[PDB]
């Protein structure tokens, strides 16, 4: 039939784990990203790039292990194993942070492969590909944060390191240096995520509490048949309840589920746009009118000015250890303190 057709029938054959054409990209890249993260968090140090212990072998735990970013002097090098920095030596490649770029690149291509898998399975099953559309938002977040943000900055060093406490450091870094909470794009991201969690909880509870009595048991879960044509819950009763409780209610189930798609996806896309702005240090750090007012009036104090003071404290107290390549030596008298304010 042609080798392409026979391969195509083999790749899309029904089995426990679907492979597909997208599997050739997805499974190696996702497997390598996950295996690289486990290998780095189990064995690989960050001593030469960050001056940190970040592996189980050094004594860290699950919260504190990380595959750390390469050193700042690497720039935006791809840090290939055969590249001019590692020169084929696996040990120096691990010591220089090459595992970070390994995980980031293989994870990016794995996310591409997973989204192509969503498209392929939607094509063969025969459904509309809205799951792939929704998955565009995690891809936007990953590309903006792990790729676009370090590319706009000086090096891969300032990207998040793949770890729990390292991600917490990334959060605190963005607060101290970018004032990322003040950014309206992050605000829309927070609204999208919290509204998505609210929509998930409220829709699940509403469906579970407007169920039709379709079985004699007191456990209602067995009163549902997958092949049934009737609705399992009363949309009219749910609409009446939320109309009288909240004032407004969904009356279209299709619009409800599209809205559940729309809210967190739009939030994540907005946060990705803000992260691109932060990649160029185009931050909503300050309001100029309040800066001028605070400069001309020493008694003017709002929560925004206190947040600026807290950000200054974060920067000065964390910069010498979080940015060890800069050789920041801050004497005690230049460190901002509240009791000297």
């Amino acid at each position: 039939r042609g080798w392409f057709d026979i391969l195509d029938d083999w790749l899309k054959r029904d089995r426990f784990v679907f492979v597909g054409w997208s599997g050739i990209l997805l499974f190696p890249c996702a497997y390598l990203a996950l295996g690289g993260w486990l290998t780095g968090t189990t064995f690989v140090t960050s001593w030469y790039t960050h001056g940190l212990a970040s592996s189980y072998l050094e004594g860290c735990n699950f919260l504190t292990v990380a595959v750390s970013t390469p050193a700042n002097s690497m720039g935006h090098s791809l840090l290939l194993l055969w590249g001019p920095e590692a020169q084929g030596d696996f040990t120096r490649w691990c010591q220089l942070g090459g595992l970070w770029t390994f995980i980031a690149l293989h994870g990016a291509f794995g996310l591409i492969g997973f989204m192509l898998r969503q498209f392929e399975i939607a094509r063969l099953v025969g459904v509309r590909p809205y799951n792939a559309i929704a998955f565009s938002a995690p891809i936007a977040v990953f590309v903006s944060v792990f790729l676009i943000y370090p590319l706009g900055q000086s090096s891969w060093f300032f990207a998040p390191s793949f770890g729990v406490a390292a991600i917490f450091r990334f959060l605190l870094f963005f607060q101290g240096f970018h004032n990322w909470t003040l950014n309206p794009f992050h605000m829309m991201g927070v609204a999208g995520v919290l509204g998505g969690a609210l929509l998930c909880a409220i829709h699940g509870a509403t469906v579970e509490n407007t169920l039709f009595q379709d079985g004699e048991g007191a456990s209602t879960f067995r009163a549902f048949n997958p092949t049934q044509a009737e609705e399992t819950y009363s949309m009219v009763t749910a609409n009446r309840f939320w109309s009288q409780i909240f004032g407004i209610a969904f009356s279209n189930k299709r619009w409800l589920h599209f809205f559940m798609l729309f809210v967190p996806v739009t939030g994540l896309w907005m946060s990705a746009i803000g992260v691109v702005g932060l990649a160029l240090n185009l931050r909503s750090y300050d309001f100029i009118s309040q800066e001028i007012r605070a400069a001309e009036d020493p008694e003017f104090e709002t929560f925004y000015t206190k947040n600026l003071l807290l950000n200054e404290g974060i920067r000065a107290w964390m910069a010498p250890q979080d940015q060890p390549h800069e050789n920041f030596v801050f004497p005690e008298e230049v460190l901002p303190r509240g009791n000297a304010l």
Partner: protein, 324 residues
């Protein structure tokens, strides 16, 4: 009938545009009072000496704030946990200067939101519904109680409650991280898993239902017009959605039961937010997150830093700047 039966039939009437109920006869005045006081304080409240050291913090729009930086400042540190109504102050100027509006708003709001939960139960009872939507609502309500009441009680002052403003909320977050290391607390990590998973499963469920909508329209009209309000047949093919999701991961990871799926959708963020509200309360009694400072020591005794040590450095930086 007498006036009491007519009033009781009006209060519990399901024909009202908004249901009142008995929880509503408490809820409406308290929430109206809190809303009116919040709007007036957010626009025009004078600066509040929140720390009791005669250094007032201006939170209202008229005193040089925008929407982002505006807040209702929490009551004074000199007030502490003392009940501070209007009549307990010598003058309205003293009540405003010590942060009395914050106490009025938060007490009225907490009472009104508890009665909102009760009203949700009440309407579910009047409509012949199952009653557990209020249980789901108990998670954000627990969070509001944690940040407005329980954390002040544990720390000993309503001055440590969360301000009623955007930048004030960020200040509350940063000072809380400085004092308690909330990011390293597993209850907050469960809360983050709850909200991230809730957003994920919300997008997932929406995309899978939207993906499997049954063709009832044309390309020139919106697909939402394929559903009629109150139609008996299901508007999407749950079997096709299950087949897609089972092929996406594997067959045993997909819900074939819509009731089980919707229970999971309810349960995941509600349990996560329960745990994060309980985390805020337990850190109010100073049971803080994991420290892990100096957890790696070399053979010669020198401390080898981890990412937790960088976090502790940042926390110390916030700590030295929020005090005095």
């Amino acid at each position: 009938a007498n006036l009491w039966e007519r009033f009781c039939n009006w209060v519990t009437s399901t024909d009202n545009r908004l249901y009142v109920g008995w929880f509503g006869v408490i809820m409406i005045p308290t929430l109206l009072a809190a809303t009116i006081c919040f709007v007036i304080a957010f626009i025009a409240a004078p600066p509040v000496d929140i720390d009791g050291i005669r250094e007032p913090v201006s939170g209202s729009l008229l005193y040089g704030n925008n929407i982002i930086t505006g807040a209702v400042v929490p009551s004074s540190n000199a007030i502490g946990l003392h009940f501070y109504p209007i009549w307990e102050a010598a003058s309205l100027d003293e009540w405003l200067y010590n942060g009395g509006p914050y106490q009025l708003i938060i007490f009225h709001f907490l009472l009104g939101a508890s009665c909102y939960m009760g009203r949700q139960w009440e309407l579910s009872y009047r409509l012949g519904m199952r009653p557990w939507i209020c249980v789901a609502y108990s998670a954000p309500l627990a969070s509001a109680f944690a940040v407005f009441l329980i954390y002040p009680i544990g720390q000993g002052s309503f001055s440590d409650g969360m301000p009623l403003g955007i930048s004030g909320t960020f200040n509350f977050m940063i000072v809380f991280q400085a004092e308690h290391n909330i990011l390293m607390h597993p209850f907050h990590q469960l809360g983050v898993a709850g909200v991230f998973g809730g957003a994920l499963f919300c997008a997932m469920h929406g995309s899978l239902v939207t993906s499997s909508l049954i063709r009832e329209t044309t390309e020139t009209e919106s697909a939402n017009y394929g559903y009629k309000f109150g139609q008996e047949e299901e508007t999407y093919n749950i079997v096709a959605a299950h087949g897609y999701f089972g092929r996406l991961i594997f067959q045993y990871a997909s819900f074939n039961n819509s009731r089980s799926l919707h229970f999971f959708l309810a349960a995941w963020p509600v349990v996560g937010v329960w745990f994060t509200a309980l985390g805020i309360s337990t850190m109010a009694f100073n049971l803080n997150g994991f420290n892990f400072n100096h957890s790696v020591i070399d053979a010669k005794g020198n401390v080898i830093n981890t990412w937790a040590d960088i976090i502790n450095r940042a926390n110390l930086g916030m700590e030295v700047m929020h005090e005095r």
